[PDB]
Each structure stands twice: as C-alpha cells, then as structure tokens.
C-alpha cells in the first residue's frame, strides 16, 4: 500500500487569486503552458491553491507518475477538485490542486 503521504515531500496552501500570475516563481512555466488553452471551467475556480511537492526517490521506488496520481485524485473527488501538474522532467515533482464550484 502506498498513500500520497508515503510519496509526498511537502504540502502547502497558497492564496493564488489568478493562476496566470502564480505566487511561486518556478511554477509559472507549466501553469501557463496548461492555461493557454481552456481545459476546464476557469470561471468555476477558487483562489485557494493547494501545491504539493513530491520527491523523485519515492516516485521512482514505486514506478509512479503524476498521471496516475492526478487520475486517482480526479476519480476519488470527481471534477469538483481540479488538479494540474507538469511533466516528469523538472527538478521538482510538483502538482497543484484547486477546488471547483
């Protein structure tokens, strides 16, 4: 059994009012690469963001990828909890959640 805590490095809640200009500087690349096309209901977005940082060691030890994790989150909570994420190439394995309304 592997829970998100076993593979997670650190979680944090931010107040990001507009995803286009994020609070963090290193997450501005993939967030805009995701937002330039409307994939979800941008109007049904909440300014409270939940950024979780993974760690490469535990990701590799279980042959796990952000795709599977995001699928599991979007299945357990449906579309009510939007999740986005970068590729498995950046130096920090990070994925950002928001609550939909």
């Amino acid at each position: 059994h592997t829970t998100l805590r076993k593979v997670t490095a650190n979680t944090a809640i931010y107040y990001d009012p507009n995803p286009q200009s994020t609070v963090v500087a290193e997450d501005q690349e993939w967030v805009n690469v995701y937002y330039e096309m409307p994939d979800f209901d941008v109007a049904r977005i909440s300014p409270w963001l939940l950024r979780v940082e993974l760690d490469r060691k535990h990701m590799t030890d279980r042959k796990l990828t952000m795709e599977q994790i995001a699928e599991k989150i979007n299945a357990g909570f449906g579309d009510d909890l939007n999740c986005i994420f970068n590729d498995d190439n950046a130096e920090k394995l990070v994925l950002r959640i928001r609550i939909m309304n």
Binding site: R5, T8, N10, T11, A12, I13, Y14, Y15, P17, W48
Partner: protein, 117 residues
C-alpha cells in the same frame, strides 16, 4: 517554501486567522475576536513538511560543548575559529532514521560553531 508563523491582532493580542477579500481579491489576516484586519505579506497560509527535512544544526546549542560525557576529537578543527578540540554526537532525535550522522561543536568558549561532516 518555509513555514508560516502565527500573527496576532494589534488590539486584542489574539491570533489572526486567514480570510479572503473578494472585493480586491486579496488575502487578509483578520481577528475573530476584535474587528482588526491586516494585509498579508507571504500569501502562504499552511506548510506541511512531510519529508521533515529539518536542519538539526539549528536544534544544537553551543552550550553542549560543556558536557563532560560527550566525546571530544582533535581530528576535526573548527572552520570558524581554528580550535582543534571539538565535541561530537549523533542526532538522537525521533523522526530521523539516518541518525548515525555526527554533528560537531567547537569547544572554544564564545565561538560555539556547530557543523557536520
């Protein structure tokens, strides 16, 4: 990222809780006892270090160099003062599995430099 500290009201000295102002779409820290509000400066409300990547050098204090029961070594001189002798000890702290790591402290008085190999 770093942790986030508690901040208190300026009137009732109670803790300020987070709140969001839709009008300006901006984070505020407001007291639920009085009617004080403040413009946040961090924008981060909560931080959990699951990995617990804590620098135990911050937990060490130089006074431990006065302990007669700690081992001393002459092989690791101090980088800050050049003193030869130094006490060393292990983490002995919970939530640290790789705790065989040694932490050194300079025994020179008023230097108290701490480091790790």
């Amino acid at each position: 990222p770093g942790f986030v500290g508690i901040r208190f009201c300026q009137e009732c000295n109670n803790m300020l809780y987070p709140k969001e102002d839709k009008e300006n779409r901006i984070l505020l820290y407001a007291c639920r006892n009085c009617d004080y509000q403040q413009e946040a400066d961090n924008s981060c409300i909560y931080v959990n270090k699951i990995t617990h990547e804590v620098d135990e050098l911050t937990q060490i204090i130089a006074d431990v160099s006065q302990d007669p029961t700690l081992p001393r070594t002459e092989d690791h001189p101090c980088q800050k003062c050049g003193h030869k002798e130094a006490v060393f000890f292990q983490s002995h702290s919970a939530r640290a599995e790789d705790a065989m790591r040694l932490y050194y402290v300079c025994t020179a008085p008023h230097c108290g430099h701490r480091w790790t190999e």
